Amino acid sequence: NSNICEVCNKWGRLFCCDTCPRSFHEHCHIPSVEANKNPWSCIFCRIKTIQERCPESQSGHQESEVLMRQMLPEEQLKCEFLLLKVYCDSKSCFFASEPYYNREGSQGPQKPMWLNKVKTSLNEQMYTRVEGFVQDMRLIFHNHKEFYREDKFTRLGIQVQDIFEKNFRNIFAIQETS
Numbered sequence: 001n002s003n004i005c006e007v008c009n010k011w012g013r014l015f016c017c018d019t020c021p022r023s024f025h026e027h028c029h030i031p032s033v034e035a036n037k038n039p040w041s042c043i044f045c046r047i048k049t050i051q052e053r054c055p056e057s058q059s060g061h062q063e064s065e066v067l068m069r070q071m072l073p074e075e076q077l078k079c080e081f082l083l084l085k086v087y088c089d090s091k092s093c094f095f096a097s098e099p100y101y102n103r104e105g106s107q108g109p110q111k112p113m114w115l116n117k118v119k120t121s122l123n124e125q126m127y128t129r130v131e132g133f134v135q136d137m138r139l140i141f142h143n144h145k146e147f148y149r150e151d152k153f154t155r156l157g158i159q160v161q162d163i164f165e166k167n168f169r170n171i172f173a174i175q176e177t178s
């Protein structure tokens with residue numbers, strides 16, 4: 001197994017996947033690495049299994065159909081994995097914890113949102129459809145773009161949104177388009 005966390009790329013107290021060489025901090029993995037379970041298989045491995053059990057699940061889908069899906073166990077897992085892919089980028093640090101807004105010439109968003117809040121919401125089964133999770137994720141970046149206006153820091157929101165959107169299209173097998 002790897003000697004660094006797959007998510008944050010640091011060493012420490014690491015839990016190793018039994019079916020692949022990846023390793024994780026307890027609260028870096030999503031869901032948090034389970035207490036017992038021998039063997040244990042990481043989220044990467046669990047997602048690969050879904051694909052292998054239903055190869056047709058990789059055929060293209062429309063975003064509007066994906067969003068309306070209920071959060072059954074496979075969709076819960078896919079949203080957890082998508083959230084984890086965002087944490088995998090170091091620039092997610094800017095979006096992880098609760099933000100505050102005091103900048104001359106700007107007013108904070110009406111509905112603040114942050115990655116750890118989405119993480120708690122998934123853990124607490126607060127989303128009934130994929131649409132609820134995707135709307136909160138996109139709101140993070142939209143709030144950032146609106147608040148930072150012409151400051152070059154706006155670009156951090158564009159960058160992390162692009163990581164979210166590419167992974168969304170991959171994980172939910174969105175139909176490729178020009």
Ligand SMILES: [Zn+2]
Binds near residue numbers: 006007009010024028
């Ligand atoms: Zn970690």
Ligand SMILES: [Zn+2]
Binds near residue numbers: 017020021042
């Ligand atoms: Zn694994």
Ligand SMILES: [Zn+2]
Binds near residue numbers: 053054055056
């Ligand atoms: Zn099948």
